[PDB]
Amino acid sequence: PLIVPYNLPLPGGVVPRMLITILGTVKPNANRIALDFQRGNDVAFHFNPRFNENNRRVIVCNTKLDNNWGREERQSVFPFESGKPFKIQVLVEPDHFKVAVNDAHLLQYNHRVKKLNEISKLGISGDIDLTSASYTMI
């Protein structure tokens, strides 16, 4: 597989119709997963499943600009389970990232960072065995 944390270059950043696919398996007794779509030091799209925040499972999304986190967007639908294989698909659409897990739509996150073609790396981290991470234009 791949060594976590893993950096996936996104050559020429992202653009609508670009689909990024992350395949792995959650470790037993997981605490967190994180995808970080970065524009340089900024994080355009942070997607952060938390397995135990006050004994609740929640996905936190956010953007970091000039080292400051913005307003979190939170989703209680939580498709991940400790120990189980998952697929995350992030499809760039004109106004948002659209995320589906295991072929089921999960959430969308409106673009706050506008220079899509400068979001040139995806960091993948957390309590997973990572199998593959790739992109394709659809």
Ligand X SMILES: NC(=O)[C@@H]1O[C@H](CO)[C@@H](O)[C@H](O)[C@@H]1S[C@@H]1O[C@H](CO)[C@H](O)[C@H](O)[C@H]1O
The binding site for Mg ion (CB under 5 A) comprises 63, 70, 112-115
75 is in an annotated binding site: yes
Tell me which amino acid residue 18 is.
M
118 is in an annotated binding site: no
70 is in an annotated binding site: yes
In the complex, what is the shortest distance from the CB of residue 108 to ligand X, in angstroms, rounded to a whole number? 17
In the complex, what is the shortest distance from the CB of residue 122 to ligand X, in angstroms, rounded to a whole number? 16
| Binding residues for ligand X restricted to 67-106, rule: CB under 6 A | 69, 72
> Residue 124 to residues 5, 22, 39, 114, 131: CA-CA distances in angstroms?
6, 9, 15, 22, 11
48 binds ligand X per the rule CB under 6 A: yes
State the residue for tokens 């030091």. 41
137 binds, among Mg ion, ligand X, none (CB under 5 to 8 A by kind): none
> Residue 87 to residues 71, 76, 125: CA-CA distances in angstroms?
26, 18, 15
Tell me which amino acid residue 101 is.
V
What distance in Å separates the CA atoms of residue 13 and residue 3, rounded to the nearest whole number? 22
Site for ligand X, rule CB under 6 A: 46, 48, 60, 62, 69, 72
Return binding residues for a beta-D-galactoside.
69-75
Return binding residues.
69-75
